[PDB]
Design a protein around this ligand. Structure first.
Ligand code: MG
Ligand code: MG
Ligand code: MG
Length: 62
RNA sequence: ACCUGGUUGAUCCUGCCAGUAGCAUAUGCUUGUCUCAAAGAUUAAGCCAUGCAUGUCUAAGUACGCACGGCCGGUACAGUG
C-alpha cells in the first residue's frame, strides 16, 4: 500500500544519460539529481554528487 | 735429584697418602658511597589465566553520512572528514 523511495541518483555521466534518456547535445550537469537536506537548527541546503567520467579541459590537456 | 714432605738392612719396582692454585654447581654470615655489566639449563622443544607485541594518506585513486561547514542561484564537485 505504501512506498519506500530510492535514495541515490546516478553518479557516472553515461549512467545519468541512460537514466534520463539524454542525447550527446544534452548537458549532463543540468540533469544531476540534487538532494535537499534540512536538519532542525540548521538552514536548508542542497547537495549534488560529483560527476565522474566527465570531459573537462584538464582531461583534454592531459 | 724435574716442588715440598711419607710407605725399606741397602738399592729398586709397582700400588698409594698429605700441602700448595684455579673452573663449575649448590649454599651460608656480613653489605656505609659510587660507576659498569649480567640474568639459559628437571635430556621438561613440558603446561599456560590476563593484557600487549603490525599497521599504513599525499596538492596528486574512489565522499550525495549536514558528521561539520563558507558562499550562493548558478547548482556537477568550496573545504574538513
Ligand atoms: Mg575521474
Ligand atoms: Mg712402598
Ligand atoms: Mg599519492
Amino acid at each position: 500500500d505504501t512506498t519506500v523511495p530510492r535514495r541515490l541518483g546516478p553518479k557516472r555521466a553515461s549512467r545519468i544519460r541512460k537514466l534520463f534518456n539524454l542525447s550527446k547535445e544534452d548537458d549532463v550537469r543540468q540533469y544531476v539529481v540534487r538532494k535537499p537536506l534540512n536538519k532542525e537548527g540548521k538552514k536548508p541546503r542542497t547537495k549534488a554528487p560529483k560527476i565522474q567520467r566527465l570531459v573537462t579541459p584538464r582531461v583534454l590537456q592531459h
